[PDB]
Design a binder for this molecule. Structure first.
Ligand SMILES: [Zn+2]
Ligand SMILES: [Zn+2]
Ligand SMILES: [Zn+2]
Ligand SMILES: [Zn+2]
Lengths: 52, 52
DNA sequence: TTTGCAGAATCGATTCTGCA
DNA sequence: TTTGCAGAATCGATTCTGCA
Protein backbone atom coordinates (compact mmCIF):
# COMPACT_ATOMS: atom_id res chain seq x y z
CA UNK A 1 0.00 0.00 0.00
CA UNK A 2 2.99 2.40 -0.39
CA UNK A 3 4.12 4.08 -3.60
CA UNK A 4 7.65 2.86 -3.82
CA UNK A 5 8.56 6.18 -5.57
CA UNK A 6 7.00 9.12 -3.80
CA UNK A 7 6.52 7.37 -0.49
CA UNK A 8 2.88 8.35 -0.07
CA UNK A 9 0.53 5.81 1.47
CA UNK A 10 -2.69 4.73 -0.27
CA UNK A 11 -5.89 3.21 1.12
CA UNK A 12 -5.64 0.09 -1.09
CA UNK A 13 -3.59 -1.96 -3.48
CA UNK A 14 -6.24 -1.38 -6.14
CA UNK A 15 -5.58 2.33 -6.06
CA UNK A 16 -1.85 2.00 -5.61
CA UNK A 17 -1.93 0.02 -8.85
CA UNK A 18 -3.56 3.01 -10.46
CA UNK A 19 -1.46 5.66 -8.69
CA UNK A 20 1.68 4.09 -10.00
CA UNK A 21 0.69 4.75 -13.56
CA UNK A 22 1.61 8.34 -13.07
CA UNK A 23 5.21 7.43 -12.32
CA UNK A 24 5.41 4.52 -14.72
CA UNK A 25 3.86 6.32 -17.66
CA UNK A 26 1.13 3.75 -18.33
CA UNK A 27 -1.91 5.56 -19.79
CA UNK A 28 -4.43 2.88 -20.76
CA UNK A 29 -7.55 5.00 -21.19
CA UNK A 30 -7.56 5.93 -24.88
CA UNK A 31 -9.60 8.73 -26.47
CA UNK A 32 -11.80 7.56 -29.28
CA UNK A 33 -11.25 10.85 -31.11
CA UNK A 34 -7.64 11.99 -30.67
CA UNK A 35 -4.40 10.44 -29.43
CA UNK A 36 -4.73 12.03 -26.00
CA UNK A 37 -4.54 9.31 -23.40
CA UNK A 38 -5.17 8.92 -19.67
CA UNK A 39 -4.03 7.06 -16.61
CA UNK A 40 -7.43 7.65 -14.84
CA UNK A 41 -11.11 7.56 -15.89
CA UNK A 42 -12.07 10.94 -14.50
CA UNK A 43 -9.56 12.64 -16.75
CA UNK A 44 -10.84 11.03 -19.92
CA UNK A 45 -14.37 11.83 -18.76
CA UNK A 46 -13.33 15.44 -18.43
CA UNK A 47 -11.50 15.55 -21.79
CA UNK A 48 -14.46 13.96 -23.54
CA UNK A 49 -16.84 16.51 -22.10
CA UNK A 50 -14.77 19.57 -22.67
CA UNK A 51 -13.36 18.71 -26.15
CA UNK A 52 -15.93 16.38 -27.80
CA UNK B 1 -12.07 49.17 -23.47
CA UNK B 2 -13.26 46.08 -25.44
CA UNK B 3 -11.12 43.15 -26.54
CA UNK B 4 -11.68 43.23 -30.24
CA UNK B 5 -11.25 39.39 -30.26
CA UNK B 6 -13.17 37.78 -27.44
CA UNK B 7 -15.58 40.65 -26.94
CA UNK B 8 -15.11 40.88 -23.19
CA UNK B 9 -15.11 44.33 -21.61
CA UNK B 10 -12.25 45.55 -19.40
CA UNK B 11 -12.14 48.25 -16.73
CA UNK B 12 -9.37 50.21 -18.51
CA UNK B 13 -7.26 50.67 -21.58
CA UNK B 14 -4.17 49.92 -19.51
CA UNK B 15 -5.43 46.44 -18.80
CA UNK B 16 -6.90 45.90 -22.22
CA UNK B 17 -3.40 46.56 -23.51
CA UNK B 18 -2.22 43.75 -21.30
CA UNK B 19 -5.18 41.43 -21.93
CA UNK B 20 -4.54 41.55 -25.61
CA UNK B 21 -1.14 39.97 -25.21
CA UNK B 22 -2.84 36.67 -24.69
CA UNK B 23 -4.39 36.80 -28.15
CA UNK B 24 -1.48 38.51 -29.84
CA UNK B 25 1.21 36.28 -28.39
CA UNK B 26 3.34 39.08 -26.94
CA UNK B 27 5.13 37.75 -23.82
CA UNK B 28 7.49 40.48 -22.65
CA UNK B 29 8.29 39.26 -19.16
CA UNK B 30 11.41 37.14 -19.57
CA UNK B 31 12.75 34.61 -17.05
CA UNK B 32 16.30 35.26 -16.03
CA UNK B 33 16.93 31.51 -15.75
CA UNK B 34 15.11 29.68 -18.56
CA UNK B 35 13.41 30.65 -21.81
CA UNK B 36 9.95 30.51 -20.25
CA UNK B 37 8.23 33.81 -20.85
CA UNK B 38 5.12 35.64 -19.64
CA UNK B 39 2.47 38.08 -20.71
CA UNK B 40 1.74 39.08 -17.03
CA UNK B 41 3.85 39.76 -13.92
CA UNK B 42 1.98 37.48 -11.57
CA UNK B 43 2.81 34.49 -13.73
CA UNK B 44 6.53 35.17 -13.78
CA UNK B 45 6.34 35.80 -10.02
CA UNK B 46 4.75 32.39 -9.65
CA UNK B 47 7.24 30.63 -11.97
CA UNK B 48 10.17 32.23 -10.18
CA UNK B 49 8.90 31.08 -6.81
CA UNK B 50 7.98 27.58 -7.74
CA UNK B 51 10.95 26.76 -10.05
CA UNK B 52 13.87 28.96 -8.85
C1' DT C 1 -7.78 58.86 -16.43
C1' DT C 2 -3.67 55.99 -15.85
C1' DT C 3 -0.25 53.06 -13.74
C1' DG C 4 0.74 49.37 -10.59
C1' DC C 5 1.43 45.73 -7.01
C1' DA C 6 0.09 41.54 -4.68
C1' DG C 7 -3.32 38.49 -4.29
C1' DA C 8 -8.07 36.34 -6.03
C1' DA C 9 -10.41 33.83 -8.97
C1' DT C 10 -10.48 30.92 -12.72
C1' DC C 11 -8.93 27.33 -16.03
C1' DG C 12 -7.33 22.90 -17.78
C1' DA C 13 -6.11 18.84 -16.09
C1' DT C 14 -4.95 15.63 -12.95
C1' DT C 15 -4.73 12.62 -8.79
C1' DC C 16 -7.50 11.19 -4.20
C1' DT C 17 -11.92 10.26 -1.35
C1' DG C 18 -16.77 9.29 0.00
C1' DC C 19 -19.77 6.16 -0.67
C1' DA C 20 -21.41 2.13 -2.42
C1' DT D 1 -10.33 -7.37 0.92
C1' DT D 2 -11.35 -5.68 -3.72
C1' DT D 3 -13.55 -3.22 -7.44
C1' DG D 4 -15.75 0.93 -8.99
C1' DC D 5 -18.26 5.27 -10.17
C1' DA D 6 -18.87 10.21 -9.94
C1' DG D 7 -17.37 13.99 -7.82
C1' DA D 8 -13.75 16.57 -4.59
C1' DA D 9 -9.68 18.42 -3.93
C1' DT D 10 -5.45 19.74 -5.65
C1' DC D 11 -1.94 21.39 -9.01
C1' DG D 12 0.34 24.33 -12.38
C1' DA D 13 -0.50 28.24 -14.57
C1' DT D 14 -2.87 31.92 -16.12
C1' DT D 15 -5.94 36.02 -16.52
C1' DC D 16 -8.90 39.65 -13.55
C1' DT D 17 -9.90 42.66 -9.25
C1' DG D 18 -9.39 45.29 -4.89
C1' DC D 19 -7.02 48.66 -3.38
C1' DA D 20 -3.86 52.11 -3.65
ZN1 LIG E 1 3.80 7.76 -5.92
ZN1 LIG F 1 -9.76 13.23 -27.72
ZN1 LIG G 1 -9.89 39.12 -25.43
ZN1 LIG H 1 12.74 30.17 -15.58
Amino acid sequence: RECSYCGKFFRSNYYLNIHLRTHTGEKPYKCEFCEYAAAQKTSLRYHLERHH
